[PDB]
Design a protein around this nucleic acid. Sequence first.
RNA 1: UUUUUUUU
Length: 756
Amino acid sequence: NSCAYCGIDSAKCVIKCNSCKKWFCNTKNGTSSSHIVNHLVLSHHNVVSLHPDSDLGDTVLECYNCGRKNVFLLGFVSVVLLCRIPCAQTKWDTDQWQPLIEDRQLLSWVAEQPTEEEKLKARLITPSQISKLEAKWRSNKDATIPPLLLRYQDAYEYQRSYGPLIKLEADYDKQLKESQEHISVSWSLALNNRHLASFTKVAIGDEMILWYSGMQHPDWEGRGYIVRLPNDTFTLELKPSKTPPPTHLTTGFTAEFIWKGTSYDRMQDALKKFAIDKKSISGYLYYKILGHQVVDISFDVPLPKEFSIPNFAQLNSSQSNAVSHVLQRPLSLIQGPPGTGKTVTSATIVYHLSKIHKDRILVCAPSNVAVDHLAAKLRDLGLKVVRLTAKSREDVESSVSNLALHNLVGRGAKGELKNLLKLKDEVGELSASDTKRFVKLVRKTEAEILNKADVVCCTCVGAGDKRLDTKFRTVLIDESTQASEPECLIPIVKGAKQVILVGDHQQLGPVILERKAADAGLKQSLFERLISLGHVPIRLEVQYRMNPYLSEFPSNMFYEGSLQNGVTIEQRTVPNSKFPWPIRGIPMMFWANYGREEISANGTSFLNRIEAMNCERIITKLFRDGVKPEQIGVITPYEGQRAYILQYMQMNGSLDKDLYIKVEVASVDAFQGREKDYIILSCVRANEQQAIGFLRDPRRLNVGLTRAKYGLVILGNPRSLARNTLWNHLLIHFREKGCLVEGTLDNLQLCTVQLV
RNA sequence: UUUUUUUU
Ligand SMILES: Nc1ncnc2c1ncn2[C@@H]1O[C@H](COP(=O)(O)OP(=O)(O)O)[C@@H](O)[C@H]1O
Ligand code: ALF
Ligand SMILES: [Mg+2]
Ligand SMILES: [Zn+2]
Ligand SMILES: [Zn+2]
Ligand SMILES: [Zn+2]
């Protein structure tokens, strides 16, 4: 009954985690969070109960209303425990709701701090000891490489360099994002004659393992795939096994989502292909990637009279010369600050390569939304685009769903396949014989569609999909600077002859969880290495996206003031606006909010209720000013804030709820390459320690400031952001303009925080 | 760090 970390034993201090049955105290000791919070965050556990002798007795904390038991959701209204959402928005006194977890530790009346005397039971413990102890419990419940080179002799040395780095990341991801009760199962038989288990971050097809250990039956394990998801029941279709399923058992089952390292697996396969598949890549590109010296090549290619496409953007001379130069090179690097038309230029290039060679082109980006964006532009130019989406996201809403391979299969299909599709939709099921027949026909149809496409669009990793068992001679990777080198390698090692890489090293880099891998240089993109090796990139420096006032800070802070404006204040102003900008003629403002951050539902992210609230007020205000939902974008660094802002407006939106769902809400990272007329930036971070996490990255702020065309509102807490040098420069820049404000939207005042 | 990627 003592804290499994340090040994504190006070009945008023310890908390039981219901999952593993271990006890933890509520003290911050060698840990940024209290020990109980630290355990929940790392282990992904949610449910806790107080000590019997505590001031509240043996009680499992749960919501009075719906009865959920995730502490990261729980708060109290005065007392009554209620979920953050939806229970705390529904109308005792909702407006005074406060979370049980405050400043990364439970409230004192839920779990006290130890007296000095009680603290004596606490053994000296380092952060290291605590960290390794959690890692150890992953398996057992117990107690307390050649460096990246400038030049590679050959592909095998290349592989032995990046390979172990990939594995490090993979192992750390698995240990970090793996998942984890008392499940009641109802059994049935699927038409295909497989066993179905129904019970109780998920998608149909996901592999799971179901197992039982207890006093009703010998140990049993079973693997299967998700075939139905909560509208309230989940349904897992089990694989055929030698040992029959215990269909007579109902309770005491455990289920576990199986971690897939698919992304890392495909990076390794690309590395191996590069070393081993002789048709995987051209000679020029091969040695280029190796870091060798190669004589520059030109393609014998007929140029068009005009590079710009009618009824679309008219390229400036730099963009035009760029497309002219690229059409004849095996390798091209397009570089430039935000909004310089890198993507429009790329779309033009793809368009022209298509007409000249009439040959399939592979188009990629690290993120899904960047892929969609580019696919849309290409479709607008009248190209036959096929968007290959991950199996995981086939049910995800998209702006280019009509281009998705799976939707193309359904549409414009006939005969036996048409029958099997209608049958599967109306019945919801297929027999064994019809399933094998269905799979054969779909593959045949998929191949035929992919083969006749002018362009195939997918994420870099998605390029490693098995459906793409064919050669792609020309590859364009947009936002390539967001990808690690092996990730970029995936689409390039498919018989590539001509490659175009677009990027900006001042915008977001790849996410490397493992610090040793990042230290070893896994953060360096292919785009960057090729440049540091002497490859001269085409540079674009005239920006066409945003009002000149919005480009000022980013230009001076990240691009040595080299970023020019191609559009004017008059081109980026709204003659009839009545939106309460602080200063006439300047469409930006930093609205200081003095809320505090909260830990999100999955225990690993953040949200900010006050910032979310004022976000709804900004949007509603814009609505009143006649600004349309499609013209507004909300970006935030944290997935926790993204989820909350979305749900919150669906409950508290002043106007028609349907208006608010059409307002895009995304993460900063996810939104790179995209733009909106109006942007709301929610910074989220606000705590006593003035810690701001990965907001320290200049490249994340850069992206956050460069999404808007007409207007930008920044919501944030200066008290904590100001400790950071970069953010301090931003606040000061806004203060100098008269745009740093506080108070209520309808009566904004100059911010009073003291900036030095 | 908490963000991108991904499932017969
Ligand atoms: N030559 C041009 N004339 C008019 N608008 C342009 C021109 N070049 C780019 N734009 C536009 O300015 C914005 C940014 O283009 P984009 O390709 O997304 O920039 P980047 O990819 O470098 O971030 C878009 O709204 C786009 O259509
Ligand atoms: F560089 Al961008 F949208 F691709 F600002
Ligand atoms: Mg772009
Ligand atoms: Zn402790
Ligand atoms: Zn636990
Ligand atoms: Zn609830």
